[PDB]
Amino acid sequence: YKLICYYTSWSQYREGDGSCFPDAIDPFLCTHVIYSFANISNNEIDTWEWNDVTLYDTLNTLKNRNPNLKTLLSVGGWNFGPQRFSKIASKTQSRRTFIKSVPPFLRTHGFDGLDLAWLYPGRRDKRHLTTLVKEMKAEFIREAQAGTEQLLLSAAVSAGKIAIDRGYDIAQISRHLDFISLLTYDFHGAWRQTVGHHSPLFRGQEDASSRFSNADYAVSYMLRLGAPANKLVMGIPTFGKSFTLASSKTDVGAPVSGPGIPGQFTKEKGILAYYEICDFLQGATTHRFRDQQVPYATKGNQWVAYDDQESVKNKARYLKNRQLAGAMVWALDLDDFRGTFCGQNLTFPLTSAVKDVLARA
Numbered sequence: 001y002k003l004i005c006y007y008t009s010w011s012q013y014r015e016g017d018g019s020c021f022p023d024a025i026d027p028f029l030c031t032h033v034i035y036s037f038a039n040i041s042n043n044e045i046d047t048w049e050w051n052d053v054t055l056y057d058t059l060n061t062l063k064n065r066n067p068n069l070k071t072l073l074s075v076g077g078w079n080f081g082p083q084r085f086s087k088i089a090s091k092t093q094s095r096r097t098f099i100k101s102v103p104p105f106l107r108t109h110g111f112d113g114l115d116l117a118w119l120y121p122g123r124r125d126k127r128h129l130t131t132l133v134k135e136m137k138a139e140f141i142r143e144a145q146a147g148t149e150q151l152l153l154s155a156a157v158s159a160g161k162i163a164i165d166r167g168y169d170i171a172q173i174s175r176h177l178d179f180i181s182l183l184t185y186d187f188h189g190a191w192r193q194t195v196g197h198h199s200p201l202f203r204g205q206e207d208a209s210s211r212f213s214n215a216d217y218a219v220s221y222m223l224r225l226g227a228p229a230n231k232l233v234m235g236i237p238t239f240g241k242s243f244t245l246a247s248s249k250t251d252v253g254a255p256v257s258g259p260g261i262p263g264q265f266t267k268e269k270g271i272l273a274y275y276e277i278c279d280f281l282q283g284a285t286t287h288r289f290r291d292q293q294v295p296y297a298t299k300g301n302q303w304v305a306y307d308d309q310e311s312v313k314n315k316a317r318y319l320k321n322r323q324l325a326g327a328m329v330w331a332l333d334l335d336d337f338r339g340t341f342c343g344q345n346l347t348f349p350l351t352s353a354v355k356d357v358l359a360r361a
């Protein structure tokens with residue numbers, strides 16, 4: 001089974017123990033580590049952070065300890081306007097320029113592959129996305145003639161039904177991609193003026209509006225659209241989503257006034273790292289959607305939807321039962337990587353729980 005793990009370059013800037021460098025990553029934890037977010041300048045892949053070349057080097061030296069480990073560099077991301085991808089992919093000449101520049105860059109810095117994070121193809125982009133994947137893959141096949149192991153090609157894809165139908169030709173891109181990571185953790189957010197879980201496993205016979213907003217539906221849908229199980233990877237979040245309650249109501253459907261206040265370390269409204277959640281739990285009330293199989297917690301006027309060891313193990317057993325290729329974990333730097341915030345004396349408690357289930361039959 002694959003265990004695909006993202007590392008984000010901006011995590012280095014967090015203060016105190018929040019600061020995370022590639023050097024903190026256990027080489028034997030994941031099968032694949034993806035460094036997050038390369039830029040595109042002059043229609044060519046390029047670094048983003050001033051010290052990326054150094055961090056690339058730190059990450060890729062984990063392979064001196066685990067020669068089986070593969071690394072990928074992901075292009076795009078949220079702070080990368082999709083309009084920009086759109087421009088690049090729409091023109092055969094801009095597209096070819098971007099594609100030709102990829103292999104030499106990956107080779108220079110020691111990556112084994114490229115991950116596409118076009119955070120969302122519009123209706124007018126579907127066709128060009130297909131072209132980008134096709135031609136990128138053809139170029140990697142050509143480059144392998146030089147005698148070096150063929151570069152891997154992956155993509156991070158929306159798990160939202162409407163977004164899927166709108167921007168992706170799943171049957172087509174699936175045959176050119178080595179794996180497809182499903183972003184099965186964005187089924188809610190401030191977005192809706194009410195409380196809800198962003199990463200439910202099942203629909204839960206309670207709510208019946210966006211029956212499509214759960215991991216199970218997305219997986220089933222992808223399989224039906226033609227993505228082979230053996231290339232599908234289910235995304236598992238290592239962060240939580242917070243909300244500021246508009247009332248004393250805590251149960252499902254409770255009114256929300258906006259996102260929660262930022263954590264001490266991640267400093268971003270609406271999100272908390274798992275290590276920040278562990279600190280938050282002391283004094284909070286914990287609940288669990290038995291239907292959806294995921295927990296939430298509340299303290300004062302703050303409501304948090306998150307995943308714990310149990311929910312992550314549960315998701316991991318599900319993916320095995322469906323014979324998927326593995327799991328993807330969004331953000332090693334958001335898990336308790338120091339292993340000093342969450343009781344138990346364990347580094348990467350969430351990611352490790354996933355690996356253990358996967359290690360089993």
Ligand SMILES: *[C@@H]1O[C@H](CO)[C@@H](O[C@@H]2O[C@H](CO)[C@@H](O)[C@H](O)[C@H]2NC(C)=O)[C@H](O)[C@H]1NC(C)=O
Nearest residue numbers: 038039040041042043046047048049050081084
């Ligand atoms: C990502 O690359 C783009 C394209 O080179 C950079 O954006 C350009 O910045 C120049 C000079 O800073 C500006 O005048 C342009 O308006 C920018 N254009 C676009 C489309 O972004 C961008 O700075 C890079 N991002 C990094 C390194 O964080």
